[PDB]
Amino acid sequence: QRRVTDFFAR
Amino acid sequence: QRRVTDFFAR
């Protein structure tokens, strides 16, 4: 499982 | 929380 934090950022 | 004990008798 990847984190969806990993694909997009602030 | 007063009770019904003390509003009616017997």
Add this chain to the structure above:
Amino acid sequence: QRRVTDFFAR
């Protein structure tokens, strides 16, 4: 209580 393994076999 009883068993139904009492009436029928192999």
Add this chain to the structure above:
Amino acid sequence: MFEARLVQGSILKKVLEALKDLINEACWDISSSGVNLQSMDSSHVSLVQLTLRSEGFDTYRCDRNLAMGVNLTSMSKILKCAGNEDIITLRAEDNADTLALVFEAPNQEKVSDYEMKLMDLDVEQLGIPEQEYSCVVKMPSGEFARICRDLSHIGDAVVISCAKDGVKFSASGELGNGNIKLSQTSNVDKEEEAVTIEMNEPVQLTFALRYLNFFTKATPLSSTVTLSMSADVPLVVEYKIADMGHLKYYLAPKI
């Protein structure tokens, strides 16, 4: 002997749903005038006052007054075995410590016939005197349940405030707080859908919701419920049992 037959059986099932959850044991007072139950819950905070006039039974024989001590849980488990359309008949040998119930399916086939042990029950019944009340609110019994449950998500206790205009239920809680205002209603199309207030003077009182929630178990007995309050004396939540009797609940207020 005593022998009462009730054509609408469901009334007696609906009754024991209201009670069984609030009071385990209770003394039924049988007499020619009919069937009278009065009990407090084990906390002594609420009081139940069932009346079923003899008038409202299809058949009613009763030679001497009885005091039948009934475990209401036992009697609920038995009325659970009665179909809704079933014709329920109570029968008690006066000189016996058991009560018989007979359920006749109104159509066909079949007749259930149960028999339940009674208990000795010296119950000091209380003397509720009849009174002018300050406020009386008649409203749909559903809307009263809907209200009591909704404020339970908020708070422990409801504050019932009552004017001419309308009536306001208020609760404070950890998460927030809320107010429900019912206004008095003319333009309905149903006499029972209406909210109406006979009001001598304004009242505001605080009650435990814990309890009002057990009371609303009577909600399938009546279109409407009436609330009677006065300054520093018990709330009376009265469910009419059409053409038969009434079920009154008394709750003591706080401070």
Add this chain to the structure above:
Amino acid sequence: MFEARLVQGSILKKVLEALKDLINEACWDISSSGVNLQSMDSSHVSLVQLTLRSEGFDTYRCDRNLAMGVNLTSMSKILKCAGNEDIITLRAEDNADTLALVFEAPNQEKVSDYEMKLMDLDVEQLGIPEQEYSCVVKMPSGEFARICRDLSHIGDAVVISCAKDGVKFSASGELGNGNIKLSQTSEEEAVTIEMNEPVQLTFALRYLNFFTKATPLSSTVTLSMSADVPLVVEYKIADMGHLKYYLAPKI
């Protein structure tokens, strides 16, 4: 290979509801003549006897006889993934230890397709020969359930007494005791009694309650009793087979 297709899928879901709660494992006997399951529950007090004649399937191919060992809980969890209107097809590669189920939504452009591991299980079947019974009661399967549940609020065991006039279910309890009399009636709503001689027997309700899980399989149920021999609760699976439950009596 073996491959059976059932247009009314719901029958097979309704079956596995009746069973899964009474028996975890069970051996399916596949053959030309159709599908035969016979199991006792873990207590050895009740016995289940499912028959689905091959006749009653829309398609039925079966080259050698199989004994498919199925965990019924596993197979219930899978039939849960089948819509009631779905067209269920069982398929077993003979030379394979897995069973495939295919659910086709009665339409097109939706097809579920599951595949469940099978286990080795000794089909030591019991003998049950068909018999003249003393009493046979046919009644609505609903009313039998309604009765069995209601007496459970009273007692552990029901006493089933049977005359010409009607049939009487009785229970004793801590709280009191209770009696239900059904009379015989003059079309599945009917109560009827083919009666050689009167019977009164005692059975555990615990069990009769697991049996009534079959109630959505049939309009009616028939009860066949004789003096000191097992009760047979037979749910007809219309134009397809039957599900017979055997319960041993007491004293």
Add this chain to the structure above:
Amino acid sequence: MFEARLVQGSILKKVLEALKDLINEACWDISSSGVNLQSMDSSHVSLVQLTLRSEGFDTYRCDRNLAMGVNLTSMSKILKCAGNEDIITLRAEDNADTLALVFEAPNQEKVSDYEMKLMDLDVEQLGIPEQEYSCVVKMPSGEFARICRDLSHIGDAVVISCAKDGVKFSASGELGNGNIKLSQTEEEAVTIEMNEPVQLTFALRYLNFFTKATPLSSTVTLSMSADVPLVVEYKIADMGHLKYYLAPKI
């Protein structure tokens, strides 16, 4: 101040059912253009993106942009006290740390009126850009739920494979394994705008929390591309949308 009135109250109850179970706290971004909520669940694996355009409210006033910090559990417990036909009005004194909700029964001359404490919360969220996706599947939102629940009896993770013909959800498990194929076929329809084939693996644990939005829409659309998040988009008719983002595996 800010003050919005929504004639179809049920929309706001249905929303907070979808969310409350996935995210306890969340920052509502109020502005002219309307109401925007974006949160990740505590695991940082899923992301929720609610949009309610101001235009789809019966009344909408809002003087400066706000960031209202709401415990969604608290706010669910309160919208539970609102009838489905009720006319819901949010009001937040800018100069206040509490949010008011007023439920007017459209019939009954009855009016519920709750008032809930707000919290400070970092509104500084993620920058999900709009993209061409490889596959897009539109299907009945029911059938998507029905599928996601059914494979949960089988396995932990679903593999969503997408061709021109149709779309296939696959799960492996302890007891066995299964495949559900939808073929292409107004809201009852299954349809696939497809640039190129995609196959991805997702946790069902999460897709099940998403299908809690199923009573918001006739249909749902799934947008996938190679090794980037699945977007499960529930349309909130003539009002906005609720987009769920889930990260794939390996």
